[PDB]
Write a protein that binds this ligand. Structure first.
Ligand SMILES: *[C@@H]1O[C@H](CO)[C@@H](O[C@@H]2O[C@H](CO)[C@@H](O[C@H]3O[C@H](CO[C@H]4O[C@H](CO)[C@@H](O)[C@H](O)[C@@H]4O)[C@@H](O)[C@H](O[C@@H]4O[C@H](CO)[C@@H](O)[C@H](O)[C@@H]4O)[C@@H]3O)[C@H](O)[C@H]2NC(C)=O)[C@H](O)[C@H]1NC(C)=O
Ligand SMILES: *[C@@H]1O[C@H](CO)[C@@H](O[C@@H]2O[C@H](CO)[C@@H](O[C@H]3O[C@H](CO[C@H]4O[C@H](CO)[C@@H](O)[C@H](O)[C@@H]4O)[C@@H](O)[C@H](O[C@@H]4O[C@H](CO)[C@@H](O)[C@H](O)[C@@H]4O)[C@@H]3O)[C@H](O)[C@H]2NC(C)=O)[C@H](O)[C@H]1NC(C)=O
Ligand SMILES: *[C@@H]1O[C@H](CO)[C@@H](O[C@@H]2O[C@H](CO)[C@@H](O[C@H]3O[C@H](CO[C@H]4O[C@H](CO)[C@@H](O)[C@H](O)[C@@H]4O)[C@@H](O)[C@H](O[C@@H]4O[C@H](CO)[C@@H](O)[C@H](O)[C@@H]4O)[C@@H]3O)[C@H](O)[C@H]2NC(C)=O)[C@H](O)[C@H]1NC(C)=O
Ligand SMILES: *[C@H]1O[C@H](CO)[C@@H](O[C@@H]2O[C@H](CO)[C@@H](O[C@@H]3O[C@H](CO)[C@@H](O)[C@H](O)[C@@H]3O)[C@H](O)[C@H]2NC(C)=O)[C@H](O)[C@H]1NC(C)=O
Ligand SMILES: *[C@H]1O[C@H](CO)[C@@H](O[C@@H]2O[C@H](CO)[C@@H](O[C@@H]3O[C@H](CO)[C@@H](O)[C@H](O)[C@@H]3O)[C@H](O)[C@H]2NC(C)=O)[C@H](O)[C@H]1NC(C)=O
Ligand SMILES: *[C@H]1O[C@H](CO)[C@@H](O[C@@H]2O[C@H](CO)[C@@H](O[C@@H]3O[C@H](CO)[C@@H](O)[C@H](O)[C@@H]3O)[C@H](O)[C@H]2NC(C)=O)[C@H](O)[C@H]1NC(C)=O
Ligand SMILES: *[C@@H]1O[C@H](CO)[C@@H](O[C@@H]2O[C@H](CO)[C@@H](O)[C@H](O)[C@H]2NC(C)=O)[C@H](O)[C@H]1NC(C)=O
Ligand SMILES: *[C@@H]1O[C@H](CO)[C@@H](O[C@@H]2O[C@H](CO)[C@@H](O)[C@H](O)[C@H]2NC(C)=O)[C@H](O)[C@H]1NC(C)=O
Ligand SMILES: *[C@@H]1O[C@H](CO)[C@@H](O[C@@H]2O[C@H](CO)[C@@H](O)[C@H](O)[C@H]2NC(C)=O)[C@H](O)[C@H]1NC(C)=O
Ligand SMILES: *[C@@H]1O[C@H](CO)[C@@H](O)[C@H](O)[C@H]1NC(C)=O
Ligand SMILES: *[C@@H]1O[C@H](CO)[C@@H](O)[C@H](O)[C@H]1NC(C)=O
Ligand SMILES: *[C@@H]1O[C@H](CO)[C@@H](O)[C@H](O)[C@H]1NC(C)=O
Ligand SMILES: *[C@@H]1O[C@H](CO)[C@@H](O)[C@H](O)[C@H]1NC(C)=O
Ligand SMILES: *[C@@H]1O[C@H](CO)[C@@H](O)[C@H](O)[C@H]1NC(C)=O
Ligand SMILES: *[C@@H]1O[C@H](CO)[C@@H](O)[C@H](O)[C@H]1NC(C)=O
Lengths: 162, 321, 321, 162, 321, 162
């Protein structure tokens, strides 16, 4: 992806994280587990939902064909009528297929971007209080219990305290 | 101790296409193209279509005796006509401006047949012997039920001078015709007068037809022809007739009581005993999709037709193998 | 001590739409859709339009006596005609190929009326009694000023055989007509000869009209009709006339002195005493925008018409609350 | 935004920075203030200006309607003519509205990108001579007077000197 | 010791455009618009076109004696006709429904001329004196080779009553005509009978023509005119003729042996002794590009026509100065 | 570019790197030279190739003009026919020109993105075992011979070993 996170420095997704699109996984003496990041997930849902409706809505005004019949010595205008009706179908077919392709690409990159940004958000808190492992994970120098872990998910990770 | 950042994955096999890559597996997708239909012709929003079956629009309106099913049809949503209806013009000929009239029907939902010139009112011409083996009914020779093939009475066809006044509120579709006989003998045999005409006039119309006599190829056993004409008689306007012979006079005409959204749909399918909000010549559509690829000519609140085989938007993200 | 990186913000409330989000407030934007007009019909680049007012193109060209304002109109930029002009054909009838002629006017900016067949030159027929109460002028019966309704003189309508040669450099629009009387009596009363015709020929034209006699609905007190025809007589070509009666002969015809960009615009508005480089049926446009949503039928150097209510591009960046 | 800077790790814009789209704010013993970054700002102006003209210019060739009249028994071709004129208006209306939507999105992301890049430019100079605070700011280990500040805006920040 | 990350550069001067920037130099590009052609008219996939040269479609089909080159032309791929062919109708007149017929030829690749009514079979009328100085051949007066201008024999033109039956499998294009003489004298001089007609009928056709007599402008020395008509006689159907005079009778008619993809191409160019898979009125195209900007009217397996001057996709990356 | 690498923090490309679009340059006691990164290069080739064919293929279904002639009193429908044929050419001309512009922009940014991602890939391995110089280069603290260099191109750079 353009932003390098999804299927990049983060090698794969998590079957275990069910209640969100992006989030955290922690490991310490007390245990381990997944937690969805609500804010970035809801951001993603709102964006993709608005996109779909934007797509559906733009295509709502579009050419409609009507029945028109012509006799045996009106072949020219019959042909004109056929070329006209067909011409617009090709135009709208192209429009629809291209929009889907282009926006699918943008949708995938958007998810890549949200993950990258979430990762940087955490990196910018932890700073030099943890080893950046190169795979989406941060190894702490201090021990980090569930309150400590929660404080990272918060945004409240008290850097000077550690 | 560590904390990791990551993203969702699942067992989804849904694929989407992009510009640079095809068949990308994603966690969630949304199909937006309706590909299925019910294969039936249905009521549009409760209102049954007019299904002409083996009749054509001409056969129906002129009242071809094989088309009595449609002698008085109620209000319709759309009309369905076969590609080559067998019961068109039983006596061979032409229907003048047929397509312009068909186009007029796409703006019409209901007719009311009324009698403008009674058959019993032709006291100086013979009105009950205008029948042909080309238009059989129940084993016997008959004719288009809405028009009267007038012939000579006791060897005299005196000049006809008739007028009808549209006293109704509603526009009136009027139909008449001219007979083009096979030879000079038939002309005198049926109408006496060797040279004849039909002159028709309204506020806008200034017509004067003359029969062209000629021997032609036989169709349904007929060498003669019938050329049919029509007009829309506005409210409070009057139509004038005048003729020496060959006049196919109106008996019934149709009141245009309701206008609006309609269409003539070409299809071989019959009635499906069925209801829908979107109909196509191949079947009806029941979906909330913004697109479909069934058929371009639809009627009702429909999705937009595209020629695609597949339209699927990505909602989720790239799913891991 | 520190250094920070940041971006501009301001008091802007301008909003723009995107695919994923609507009504995003930005620091700077650029509207590209012209929504306003001046509500007037104006000179196009100094050149005033022909405003037919209550006349139609037929009334104007045939010279309906209620349309003397346009007896000799100068060069125009565009033409303006009402939806249902009251002064069309004062004597009822038809105008043959009327729309093909109107289409011809969209390529014409200037006519010059010239006399091809003088009224005083009809020495064997009566030329000054061709008037009707259907075409009143100043309380009196009159007629289309550009054509001559010729009737019998001392109970004889001899065969007319006239010819005009287009000696001018410029294409010549010629107009004539045929009278369709109400009955056999009027035919002889006006023209003597019971059977008549008008034969017209040029290099390309091979016409031969015959009056259709019939009693019709009365319009402006008339049961008879006038069917008008036209042609473009090329330079150095000649038009031949021949008739027994019912001939509505040309007196004046129009030289086509200037061709080019023009249009017939349908509008109820009158002249605005005004100037513009872009005109629409609802008003004129003065803007540098690439788009507008006023009306599709424009003339002049105009923005491109779209159906949008709003087109605003973001230039600046997302503005902070 | 896709690039995470605008309304992201940089929480809001600056009312106080009037003479540019992107720039710097400094704070030391001598005082504080805003300075626009000329190069990236002019880059932004050139890009957006070319885009607008590109948009205006592509739409310059586009369908124009003409007056065409038909009689009472030419309804079929009148209808054809109406469906044809309308068909093209819908096509160009769609084209225009979609282009504006798509390019508005790209314009906003472009500004996000320019800010992110400016931020990284400074980060790559200062390296480990300053604390990355996580909000667009860098706190120096050494004192940094106006010449020092200017040298960062320059590109000339002499890293080894400090 | 160090390791650096970087990207490719080269000596490329290829430029591409983007929305925000024009003329960006890139390492690699791909042109997708064909701008060149060979300037010639060529065989389409081995099958030579019909190049009418100085003849028109009318001159060819009616058999204008200046158009003997096309007396029997083999199967063609497309047809080429000049903008204003000099050899059209040698005797002036009209060709009825000419454009509808031309449109029919776009679906036809091969004709077979056959004799339906032999010239020697006209035993009661003169058939070998129907010639004009307007249609010269080899210094002498001649006429359209495929039709017979029948005139009176020993001062009698008796009624013609002929019939032809299409016994062939293939649709048959039939052509005939009517003569419109200059005056009453010529009518009797050529045909005796003052009042005449031609009546034509098939299964679908119900025609009856009458000559319009009038003095007209002289074209190729002729004041009279010839109005030509046509029909498609279906298999196993028969065409009926009947006339008092002025009949231009068919001798030869064309069998429609092959239908399919064809076109009438308007071009002043002649044959190029050449082969191609894509032809345009200005020249042929040999390329694998998805687009071209040569001309919109092409025939064959062609790239798609756009109005661009330039279409170049970037493949590589921004190249360093 | 949107991603900041090409003609950004990496000032220019390399004439010397001939066998790939992106790669590495090393300098140590044994010598120096260029090596293409195969994986990201082939990724780039596949993407751009699919794009071109996607473009070519979408435009394959498109309006075709036919010969249609009309007489002197069929000017209205002749004009209609002309406006119709021309209308579709303008639509497809616009479609083609716009697609090329838009996708050219995306293609250039895609290359920028691949370079940025390659750079981050290496940065995330070396971590604090090298000075990030700010110009695409990393200066090692330890000596790094050709095996060491190769191990960085591998992905196998044994961080703890140094
Ligand atoms: C088919 O039939 C209908 C009738 O069945 C024909 O229309 C009728 O035509 C006759 C004349 O032939 C008209 O006669 C009278 O018209 C009005 C009637 O009253 C007017 O005002 C009332 C007021 O509410 C209104 O309801 C009516 O609609 C109408 O507007 C009389 O005024 C008129 O007499 C006039 O007196 C004036 C002063 O005394 C004079 O200045 C006038 O010159 C005039 O003499 C006359 O007696 C009918 O009105 C008319 N009916 C309708 C409904 O239109 C119709 O024409 C016919 N078809 C054809 C083709 O002819
Ligand atoms: C409406 O009126 C105009 C005239 O007012 C008609 O056109 C005219 O038709 C007459 C014949 O009816 C022609 O007569 C003579 O034509 C040329 C004139 O000179 C030619 O060369 C000069 C040189 O500059 C040039 O200006 C002229 O335009 C023209 O090209 C004579 O040569 C010709 O005599 C010929 O002599 C030759 C050798 O002696 C012979 O081989 C020829 O056979 C021929 O006898 C003749 O006397 C007019 O030229 C012509 N005028 C114009 C302007 O066209 C017009 O036809 C009419 N309408 C209709 C429908 O008829
Ligand atoms: C131009 O010429 C052709 C002939 O050259 C005309 O068509 C022909 O029209 C005649 C009548 O005028 C028909 O005569 C006979 O038709 C059939 C022939 O046999 C049928 O079955 C065979 C079986 O294989 C098949 O090959 C034939 O195609 C056809 O289907 C006879 O059956 C028929 O006699 C019938 O006998 C029945 C029982 O005894 C009766 O119920 C019937 O009423 C009828 O009497 C008759 O003798 C030709 O068939 C027909 N030929 C073709 C090829 O169509 C053509 O009409 C003419 N043009 C015009 C405009 O008229
Ligand atoms: C996000 O998470 C952090 C870390 O868990 C939160 O800080 C913790 O918040 C809890 C619950 O409010 C505090 O519990 C309190 O303890 C005191 C006694 O110490 C007691 O008086 C209260 O009744 C309550 O039980 C806890 O002290 C606190 N711990 C730490 C290390 O900060 C923080 O509140 C969250 N912040 C946001 C913005 O969500
Ligand atoms: C960008 O800014 C840096 C830091 O301010 C500039 O360096 C400074 O430039 C000034 C003005 O040229 C120098 O002033 C000079 O001082 C010497 C005596 O020391 C005097 O002989 C000259 O007449 C002049 O006044 C100043 O020394 C210098 N300071 C430092 C710490 O570098 C730099 O020139 C700028 N570079 C670019 C590329 O814009
Ligand atoms: C990528 O490159 C690294 C670093 O060069 C590779 O490690 C090296 O691989 C070579 C070739 O396989 C090893 O050579 C072997 O040496 C042993 C004796 O030490 C000998 O028994 C074998 O016959 C062979 O010659 C070398 O030891 C090794 N060096 C280091 C420092 O790791 C690595 O294999 C590559 N990995 C990938 C995934 O491409
Ligand atoms: C992407 O997937 C589609 C659908 O699975 C592939 O199309 C099918 O290919 C199979 C195997 O060759 C054929 O038997 C089917 O007829 C195809 N079905 C349809 C609906 O097209 C397609 O080939 C794949 N595309 C790419 C580029 O890999
Ligand atoms: C975005 O803003 C527009 C314009 O301010 C909103 O449309 C208006 O909504 C108000 C409040 O309901 C209505 O009274 C007006 O009639 C609307 N005006 C116009 C011009 O549309 C719109 O609802 C907003 N859209 C979203 C998605 O929030
Ligand atoms: C981008 O380059 C093109 C082609 O090199 C430029 O167009 C040419 O400009 C020269 C110099 O003014 C003219 O003489 C030519 O007539 C032009 N050729 C063509 C094919 O257009 C164009 O001006 C440049 N565009 C920009 C924005 O710099
Ligand atoms: C995929 O997992 C879901 C759990 O949400 C389960 O309901 C479903 O049965 C699974 N489907 C398949 C095909 O394995
Ligand atoms: C349409 O489909 C839905 C299920 O998607 C069904 O429940 C409903 O009855 C259908 N509506 C009609 C009118 O048949
Ligand atoms: C916004 O600020 C500008 C300063 O550039 C000022 O001129 C203007 O009055 C302000 N507008 C509003 C609505 O506050
Ligand atoms: C158009 O508008 C401008 C202001 O935008 C005005 O100054 C100018 O006079 C106007 N032009 C015309 C021709 O009315
Ligand atoms: C560019 O370099 C290539 C090497 O691939 C060489 O073949 C070619 O001659 C050079 N072209 C120019 C114009 O210098
Ligand atoms: C078309 O061009 C190719 C070169 O690109 C040439 O080799 C080939 O012979 C040409 N084909 C024809 C049919 O002329």
């Amino acid at each position: 992806g353009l932003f390098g996170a999804i299927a990049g420095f983060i090698e794969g997704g998590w079957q275990g994280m069910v209640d969100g699109w992006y989030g955290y996984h922690h490991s310490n003496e007390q245990g381990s587990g997944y937690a969805a990041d609500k804010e970035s997930t809801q951001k993603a849902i709102d964006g993709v939902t608005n996109k779909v409706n934007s797509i559906i809505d733009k295509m709502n005004t579009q050419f409609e064909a009507v029945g028109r019949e012509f006799n045996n010595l009106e072949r020219r205008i019959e042909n004109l009528n056929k070329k006209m009706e067909d011409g617009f179908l090709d135009v709208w077919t192209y429009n629809a297929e291209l929009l889907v392709l282009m926006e699918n690409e943008r949708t995938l990159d958007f998810h890549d971007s949200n993950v990258k940004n979430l990762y940087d958000k955490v990196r910018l808190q932890l700073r030099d209080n943890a080893k950046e492992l190169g795979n989406g994970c941060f190894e702490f120098y201090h021990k980090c219990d569930n309150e400590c872990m929660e404080s990272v998910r918060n945004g409240t990770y008290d850097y000077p305290q550690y | 101790d560590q904390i990791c950042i990551g993203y969702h994955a699942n067992n989804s096999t849904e694929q989407v296409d992009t510009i640079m890559e095809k068949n990308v597996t994603v966690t969630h997708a949304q199909d937006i193209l309706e590909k299925t239909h019910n294969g039936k012709l249905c009521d549009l929003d409760g209102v049954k279509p007019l299904i002409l079956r083996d009749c054509s629009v001409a056969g129906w309106l002129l009242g071809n005796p094989m088309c009595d099913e449609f002698i008085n049809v109620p209000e319709w949503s759309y009309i369905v006509e076969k590609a080559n209806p067998v019961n068109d013009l039983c006596y061979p000929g032409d229907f003048n401006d047929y397509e312009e009239l068909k186009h007029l029907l796409s703006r019409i939902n209901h007719f009311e047949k009324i009698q403008i010139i009674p058959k019993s009112s032709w006291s100086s011409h013979e009105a009950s012997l205008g029948v042909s083996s080309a238009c059989p009914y129940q084993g016997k020779s008959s004719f288009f039920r809405n028009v009267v093939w007038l012939i000579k009475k006791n060897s005299t066809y005196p000049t006809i001078k008739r007028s009808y006044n549209n006293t109704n509120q509603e526009d009136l579709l009027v139909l008449w015709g001219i007979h083009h006989p096979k030879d000079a003998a038939e002309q005198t045999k049926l109408y006496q007068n060797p040279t004849t005409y039909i002159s028709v006039g309204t506020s806008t119309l200034n017509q004067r037809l003359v029969p062209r006599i000629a021997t032609r190829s036989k169709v349904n056993g007929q060498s003669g022809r019938m050329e049919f004409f029509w007009t829309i008689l506005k409210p409070n306007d009057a139509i004038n007739f005048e003729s020496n012979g060959n006049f196919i006079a109106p008996e019934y005409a149709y009141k245009i009581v309701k206008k609006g959204d309609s269409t003539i749909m070409k299809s071989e399918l019959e009635y499906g005993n069925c209801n829908t909000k979107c109909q196509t010549p191949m079947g009806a559509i029941n979906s909330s999709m913004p697109f479909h690829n069934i058929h371009p000519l639809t009627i009702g609140e429909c999705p937009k037709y595209v020629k695609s085989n597949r339209l699927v938007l990505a909602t989720g993200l790239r799913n891991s193998p």
